[PDB]
Amino acid sequence: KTSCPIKINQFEGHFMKLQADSNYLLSKEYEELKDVGRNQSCDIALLPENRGKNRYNNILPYDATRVKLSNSDYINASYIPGNNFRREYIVTQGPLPGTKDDFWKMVWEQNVHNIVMVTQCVEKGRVKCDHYWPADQDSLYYGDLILQMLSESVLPEWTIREFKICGEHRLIRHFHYTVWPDHGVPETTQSLIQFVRTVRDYINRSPGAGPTVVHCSAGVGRTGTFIALDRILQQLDSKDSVDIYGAVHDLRLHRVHMVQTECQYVYLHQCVRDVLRARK
Numbered sequence: 001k002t003s004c005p006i007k008i009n010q011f012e013g014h015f016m017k018l019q020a021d022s023n024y025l026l027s028k029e030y031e032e033l034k035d036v037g038r039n040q041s042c043d044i045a046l047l048p049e050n051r052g053k054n055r056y057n058n059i060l061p062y063d064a065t066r067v068k069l070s071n072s073d074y075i076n077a078s079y080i081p082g083n084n085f086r087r088e089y090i091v092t093q094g095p096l097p098g099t100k101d102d103f104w105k106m107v108w109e110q111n112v113h114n115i116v117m118v119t120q121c122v123e124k125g126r127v128k129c130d131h132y133w134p135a136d137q138d139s140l141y142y143g144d145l146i147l148q149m150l151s152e153s154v155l156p157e158w159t160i161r162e163f164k165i166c167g168e169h170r171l172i173r174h175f176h177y178t179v180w181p182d183h184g185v186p187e188t189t190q191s192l193i194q195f196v197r198t199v200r201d202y203i204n205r206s207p208g209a210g211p212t213v214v215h216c217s218a219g220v221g222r223t224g225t226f227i228a229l230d231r232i233l234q235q236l237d238s239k240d241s242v243d244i245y246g247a248v249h250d251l252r253l254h255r256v257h258m259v260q261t262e263c264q265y266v267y268l269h270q271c272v273r274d275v276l277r278a279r280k
């Protein structure tokens with residue numbers, strides 16, 4: 001099983017059916033995804049060299065799909081296919097104090113113009129991501145790069161920041177969703193749907209951009225849900241039919257744990273359901 005497409009017109013009843021007996025058919029599909037991609041080696045991520053480069057020792061890129069620092073080429077970051085092309089996203093863990101120069105190096109080399117962050121830095125007193133961009137308008141050195149924040153706009157559920165980066169100038173936009181708790185789901189579908197549509201709008205406005213960066217803490221759950229939502233919301237505009245199973249499957253061929261909880265998988269369905277409810 002690589003794909004379970006569901007006709008737009010069948011979805012409400014289908015999803016009803018999925019949620020029956022305590023999400024019983026849902027848990028089965030989610031369970032079926034469990035081992036996807038997991039036959040692949042993680043050997044470079046496991047070198048002694050690289051140990052301090054990994055936030056979490058069980059969340060490592062596959063050797064086959066890992067992003068490489070041009071060049072010790074090692075970053076915890078994976079290439080991810082999207083609705084439109086094969087290297088559409090780069091997905092990474094929340095930077096560490098000791099890898100934030102690496103992270104900006106990758107951003108520069110890969111021609112990234114848009115970053116999506118869907119974790120906070122510290123949640124319930126637990127560190128999730130370093131505060132890896134400038135704290136104000138003063139320019140900062142990140143290895144061989146200089147970065148300056150040009151603007152920060154704080155909205156209730158996300159904050160958009162514009163940076164200028166120069167090497168030894170590109171404009172970068174950073175879309176930070178602030179209300180998605182780790183291992184959890186946002187409070188509403190409407191919020192993330194609208195954030196997803198905002199980002200994609202700007203992506204469309206970014207001629208020639210490299211991959212879009214998406215990250216959270218480990219770079220798998222909220223990051224994987226974000227991207228799966230981005231992909232299906234495009235399918236809802238182009239197709240008779242949406243393939244939530246297929247999307248998550250695909251993400252898993254490329255990185256462990258993409259969409260990391262059953263509830264995140266349920267939430268993807270709740271999103272598609274509500275969009276279609278709104279249309280009807």
Ligand SMILES: Cc1nc(C(Cc2ccccc2)(Cc2ccc(NS(=O)(=O)O)cc2)c2noc(C)n2)no1
Pocket residue numbers: 056057058059119182183216217218219220221222223257260
């Ligand atoms: C070492 C070790 N770290 C872990 C963690 C964090 C963790 C550790 C111990 C208990 C619960 C979670 C890593 C982790 C941390 C955060 C996220 N969520 S994400 O930020 O949205 O990707 C996903 C994974 C994990 N959580 O789910 C899975 C799968 N791995 N497990 O072993």
